[PDB]
Amino acid sequence: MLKPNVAIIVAALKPALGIGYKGKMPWRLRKEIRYFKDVTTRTTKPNTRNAVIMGRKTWESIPQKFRPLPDRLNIILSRSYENEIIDDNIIHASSIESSLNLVSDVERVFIIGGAEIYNELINNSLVSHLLITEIEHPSPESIEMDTFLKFPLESWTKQPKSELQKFVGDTVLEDDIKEGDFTYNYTLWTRK
Ligand X SMILES: CC[C@@H](C#Cc1c(C)nc(N)nc1N)c1cc(OC)c(OC)c(OC)c1
Binding residue for ligand X, selected from 7, 17, 32, 109, defined by CB under 6 A: 32
Q: Does 99 bind ligand X (CB under 6 A)?
A: no
CB of 9 to ligand NDP, least distance (A): 7
| Gap between the Cα atoms of 180 and 27, Å rounded | 9
| Residue showing the smallest CB distance to ligand X in the complex | 36
- Binding residues for ligand X, how many (CB under 6 A)? 15
Question: Which of 38, 104 has the CB closer to ligand X?
Answer: 38
Question: Which of 13, 112 has the CB closer to ligand X?
Answer: 112
CB of 11 to ligand X, least distance (A): 4
For the chain, the three-class secondary structure string (H helix, E strand, C coil) is CCCCCEEEEEEEECCCCEEEECCECCCCCHHHHHHHHHHHHCCCCCCCEEEEEEEHHHHHHCCHHHCCCCCEEEEEECCCCCCEEEECCEEEECCHHHHHCCCCCEEEEEEEECHHHHHHHCCCCCEEEEEEEEEECCCHHHCCCCEECCCCHHHEEECCHHHHHHHHCCCCCCCCEEECCEEEEEEEEEEC
Binding residue for ligand X, selected from 4, 6, 7, 10, defined by CB under 6 A: 10
Q: Does 132 bind ligand NDP (CB under 6 A)?
A: no
Q: Does 58 bind ligand X (CB under 6 A)?
A: yes
Residue 27's closest CA among 184, 182, 189, 190?
A: 182
CB of 9 to ligand X, least distance (A): 4
CB of 73 to ligand X, least distance (A): 14
For ligand NDP, the binding residues (CB under 6 A) are 10-11, 19-20, 23-25, 54-58, 77-80, 94-95, 113-117, 120, 147
For ligand X, the binding residues (CB under 6 A) are 9-11, 32-33, 36, 54, 58, 61-63, 69, 112-113, 133
